[PDB]
Amino acid sequence: ERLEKYRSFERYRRRAEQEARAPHWWRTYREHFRTQKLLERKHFLRELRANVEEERAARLRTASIPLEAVRAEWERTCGPYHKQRLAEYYGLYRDLFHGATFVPWVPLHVAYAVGEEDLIPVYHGNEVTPTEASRAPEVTYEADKDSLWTLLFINLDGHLLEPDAEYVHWLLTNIPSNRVAEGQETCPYLPPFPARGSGFHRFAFLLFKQDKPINFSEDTRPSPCYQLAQRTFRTFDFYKRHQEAMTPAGLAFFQCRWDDSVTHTFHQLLDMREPVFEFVRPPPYHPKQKRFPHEQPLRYLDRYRDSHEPTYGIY
């Protein structure tokens, strides 16, 4: 009686949801399943509050916000952290580095040019058709002077023979500062080739800070190379060999399905018959037959038959 009682449904709901998050003794569903910036920040706010026009629009409920300005500011402040969530959510950190997690810090930007009028961007989790990815994409990531780089683009789940391995698409090395044309093309650019009926493949862009120029002669690949046995590649072991001078700083990944252009890639240059896959569900469970299916309909016999066509044996 001393404690007050929730006077509204929402109060209980907010209490309940917060209550659910906390761990409990009893089994539950979840178990099984700087200062100067502050001062400057405040000062800008006060100016915004003073503006009468801001008040009038708000009370007239006609105000609006510029999305582009927020996006750029969001990138500076906490974009690294949100990007990390997507990478963990999409499984990049577990499939790439065997569970190691790195916060992206370089605001990497990639877009696939469609003709010349417009260019398709590649954000985190975006959808880009293989036709759109036929040619290599423009990359601008605001390196600043010096600080050599290496750009690595790979499809994590596109391998056709070994599950763990993945296929390199193009690898640029010794990229000095912003300019990317000055990079050694160890791996030539290949169009994405996701098999038909194989679901959505996730392709990611990886940028590594380079302390000192290192010749990646082992990772150099002949240009052009159309052999999948040579495109097989593990990010995890590769980063081990270069972890001294390679530290990741950028991310960008997109999802793509199969497409008619994929048919061209499998035949024209890969020079192999294209693989076709289908989603197969497991056979339905039926209890073991009984010689006498007592109290069962006539359909019982059809459940355990394989061929729908009559047979005659000796006749």
Partner 1 sequence: LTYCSTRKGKRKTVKSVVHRFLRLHSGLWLRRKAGYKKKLWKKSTARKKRLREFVFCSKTQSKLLDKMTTSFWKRRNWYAGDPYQMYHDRTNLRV
Partner 2 sequence: KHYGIKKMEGHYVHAGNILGTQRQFRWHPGAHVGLGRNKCLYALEEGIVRYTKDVYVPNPKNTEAVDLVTSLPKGAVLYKTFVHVVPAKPEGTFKLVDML
Partner 3 sequence: LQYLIDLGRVDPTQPIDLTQLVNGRGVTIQPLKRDYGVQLVEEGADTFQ
Residues lying near RNA in the complex (CB under 7 A): 284-287, 294-295, 297, 299, 302-303
Contact stretch for partner 2 (CB under 8 A) within 16-24, 58-66, 201-209, 219-227: 16-24
With b for 16 or more beta-carbon neighbours within 10 A and e for fewer, the 268-294 pattern comes to eebeeeeeeeeeeeeeeeeeeeeeeee
Measured from the CB atom, is 118 or 295 closer to Mg ion? 295
What is each CA distance from 90 to 59, 106, 263, in whole angstroms? Answer: 42, 19, 27
Contact yes or no for 155/232 (Cβ under 8 A):
no
Contact stretch for partner 3 (CB under 8 A) within 69-77, 85-93, 272-280, 306-314: 306-314
SS3 of residue 152 by DSSP: strand
Which entry of Mg ion, partner 1, RNA, none binds 303, CB below 5 to 8 A by partner kind?
RNA
Contact stretch for partner 3 (CB under 8 A) within 54-62, 180-188, 256-264, 304-312: 304-312
Least Cβ distance, residue 291 to partner 1 (angstroms): 6
Residue in 137, 141, 153, 126 with CA at minimum distance from that of residue 235: 153
Residue in 256, 277, 265 with CA at minimum distance from that of residue 228: 265
187-206 binders of partner 2 (CB under 8 A): 197-199
Which entry of Mg ion, partner 2, partner 1, none binds 13, CB below 5 to 8 A by partner kind?
partner 2
Contact stretch for partner 1 (CB under 8 A) within 125-133, 209-217, 248-256, 297-305: 297-305
Residue 44 engages partner 3 in binding (rule: CB under 8 A): no
Tell whether the torsion through CA atoms of 233, 235, 241 and 244 is positive or negative.
positive
What span, in angstroms and rounded, lies between the C-alpha atoms of 12 and 292? 56
Residue 306 engages partner 1 in binding (rule: CB under 8 A): yes
Question: Whats the size of the chain, residue-wise?
Answer: 315
Least Cβ distance, residue 287 to Mg ion (angstroms): 17
Residue 29 engages partner 2 in binding (rule: CB under 8 A): yes
Least Cβ distance, residue 312 to partner 3 (angstroms): 5
Contact yes or no for 166/232 (Cβ under 8 A):
yes
Tokens of 213: 């120029």
Which entry of partner 1, partner 2, Mg ion, none binds 293, CB below 5 to 8 A by partner kind?
partner 1
SS3 of residue 210 by DSSP: strand
What span, in angstroms and rounded, lies between the C-alpha atoms of 200 and 102? 24
Contact yes or no for 92/204 (Cβ under 8 A):
yes
Which entry of partner 2, partner 3, RNA, none binds 185, CB below 5 to 8 A by partner kind?
none
SS3 of residue 88 by DSSP: helix
| Cα-to-chain-centroid distance, residue 171 | 19
Residue 285 engages partner 3 in binding (rule: CB under 8 A): no
What span, in angstroms and rounded, lies between the C-alpha atoms of 173 and 190? 17
- The structure tokens 């010349």 sit at 116
Measured from the CB atom, is 292 or 312 closer to partner 3? 312
Q: Which of 8, 18, 36, 311 binds partner 3 (CB under 8 A)?
A: 311
Residue 285 engages partner 2 in binding (rule: CB under 8 A): yes
Residues within the interface to partner 2 (CB under 8 A): 3-9, 11-13, 15-16, 19-20, 24, 26-29, 31-33, 197-199, 273-282, 285
Residues within the interface to partner 1 (CB under 8 A): 289-298, 300-302, 304-306, 310-311
